[PDB]
């Protein structure tokens with residue numbers, strides 16, 4: 550619709566955040582809208598108007614998790630290497646991830662009724678993304694400044 554794709558791989562361009570607490574013991578996570586039981590991290594599709602990936606990230610973090618913070622690091626890109634449904638390979642999604650230091654969480658936000666939202670230690674957060682079958686999101690988490698204990 551209004552989405553943007555890599556001119557090389559034709560993959561859909563996404564940006565998101567690893568929203569860490571100030572102490573950096575916990576990371577904010579949200580539930581998928583399609584898969585209502587899977588815990589992921591805030592991200593969404595880049596739109597034409599958006600000048601940089603930081604814009605898409607901070608927007609998507611707000612819309613999806615009602616989270617406000619400053620980007621303290623670029624974590625680089627990870628790919629969603631998901632084989633096409635008629636599989637029985639070019640990547641599906643390129644994600645541009647930033648580390649964000651949480652300044653505030655709001656009780657209202659545009660998908661406050663469509664998603665849940667919780668802070669998880671590195672351990673619980675690792676298992677959640679295993680359960681979710683999203684290792685490219687775990688790769689991003691690992692590039693963060695999160696404490697591993």
Ligand SMILES: O=C(CP(=O)(O)O)O[C@@H]1[C@@H](OP(=O)(O)O)[C@H](OC(=O)CP(=O)(O)O)[C@H](OP(=O)(O)O)[C@H](OP(=O)(O)O)[C@H]1OP(=O)(O)O
Pocket residue numbers: 550552561563580581582583584589592593594629631641642
């Ligand atoms: O499920 C997947 C892809 P995967 O099954 O991991 O290969 O992602 C959907 C995405 O559709 P797709 O085009 O297949 O990537 C969904 O996107 C689309 O439907 C866009 P399109 O159908 O490709 O135009 C949508 O992703 P975006 O947030 O980036 O929009 C879904 O996110 P949701 O809104 O449910 O949180 C996202 O699910 P998830 O990341 O598990 O939460």
